[PDB]
Amino acid sequence: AATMKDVALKAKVSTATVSRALMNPDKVSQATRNRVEKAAREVGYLP
């Protein structure tokens, strides 16, 4: 019962990134970007 928000903290992404992920999902670092994609399937939750 995880959340895309909880993952941000786990991957120390950025309160703005995860928040922008719905506005402009093209600012995350390449490396951090690949992790998010995979991390998204794991949690499979991103309202």
PDB file of C-alpha atoms in Angstrom:
ATOM      1  CA  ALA A   1       0.000   0.000   0.000  1.00  0.00           C
ATOM      2  CA  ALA A   2       2.780   2.403  -0.989  1.00  0.00           C
ATOM      3  CA  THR A   3       2.425   5.732  -2.807  1.00  0.00           C
ATOM      4  CA  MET A   4       4.345   7.578  -5.521  1.00  0.00           C
ATOM      5  CA  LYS A   5       4.962  10.220  -2.863  1.00  0.00           C
ATOM      6  CA  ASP A   6       6.553   7.785  -0.426  1.00  0.00           C
ATOM      7  CA  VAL A   7       8.909   6.633  -3.166  1.00  0.00           C
ATOM      8  CA  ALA A   8      10.161  10.186  -3.660  1.00  0.00           C
ATOM      9  CA  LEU A   9      11.526  10.140  -0.118  1.00  0.00           C
ATOM     10  CA  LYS A  10      12.936   6.638  -0.598  1.00  0.00           C
ATOM     11  CA  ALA A  11      14.751   7.818  -3.746  1.00  0.00           C
ATOM     12  CA  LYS A  12      15.414  11.307  -2.332  1.00  0.00           C
ATOM     13  CA  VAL A  13      14.173  12.696  -5.640  1.00  0.00           C
ATOM     14  CA  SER A  14      12.653  16.087  -4.824  1.00  0.00           C
ATOM     15  CA  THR A  15       9.349  17.421  -3.504  1.00  0.00           C
ATOM     16  CA  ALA A  16       9.157  19.420  -6.746  1.00  0.00           C
ATOM     17  CA  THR A  17      10.011  16.541  -9.075  1.00  0.00           C
ATOM     18  CA  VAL A  18       7.361  14.145  -7.799  1.00  0.00           C
ATOM     19  CA  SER A  19       5.001  17.132  -7.759  1.00  0.00           C
ATOM     20  CA  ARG A  20       6.020  18.191 -11.269  1.00  0.00           C
ATOM     21  CA  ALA A  21       5.791  14.584 -12.422  1.00  0.00           C
ATOM     22  CA  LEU A  22       2.182  15.511 -13.246  1.00  0.00           C
ATOM     23  CA  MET A  23       3.013  18.932 -14.715  1.00  0.00           C
ATOM     24  CA  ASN A  24       6.343  18.391 -16.486  1.00  0.00           C
ATOM     25  CA  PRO A  25       7.802  14.848 -16.132  1.00  0.00           C
ATOM     26  CA  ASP A  26      11.013  15.645 -18.017  1.00  0.00           C
ATOM     27  CA  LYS A  27      13.302  17.288 -15.442  1.00  0.00           C
ATOM     28  CA  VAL A  28      14.326  14.237 -13.428  1.00  0.00           C
ATOM     29  CA  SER A  29      17.936  13.142 -13.839  1.00  0.00           C
ATOM     30  CA  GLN A  30      18.473  10.439 -16.452  1.00  0.00           C
ATOM     31  CA  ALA A  31      19.675   7.978 -13.825  1.00  0.00           C
ATOM     32  CA  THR A  32      17.002   9.004 -11.332  1.00  0.00           C
ATOM     33  CA  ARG A  33      14.519   8.889 -14.206  1.00  0.00           C
ATOM     34  CA  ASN A  34      15.146   5.215 -14.942  1.00  0.00           C
ATOM     35  CA  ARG A  35      14.720   4.397 -11.255  1.00  0.00           C
ATOM     36  CA  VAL A  36      11.391   6.206 -11.054  1.00  0.00           C
ATOM     37  CA  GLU A  37      10.003   4.329 -14.060  1.00  0.00           C
ATOM     38  CA  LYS A  38      10.844   0.995 -12.433  1.00  0.00           C
ATOM     39  CA  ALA A  39       9.919   2.257  -8.964  1.00  0.00           C
ATOM     40  CA  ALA A  40       6.528   3.233 -10.377  1.00  0.00           C
ATOM     41  CA  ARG A  41       5.718  -0.325 -11.449  1.00  0.00           C
ATOM     42  CA  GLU A  42       6.699  -1.663  -8.038  1.00  0.00           C
ATOM     43  CA  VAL A  43       4.278   0.663  -6.245  1.00  0.00           C
ATOM     44  CA  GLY A  44       1.963   0.798  -9.266  1.00  0.00           C
ATOM     45  CA  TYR A  45       0.320   3.861  -7.677  1.00  0.00           C
ATOM     46  CA  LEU A  46       0.398   7.347  -9.204  1.00  0.00           C
ATOM     47  CA  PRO A  47      -3.033   9.067  -9.093  1.00  0.00           C
TER      48      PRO A  47
END
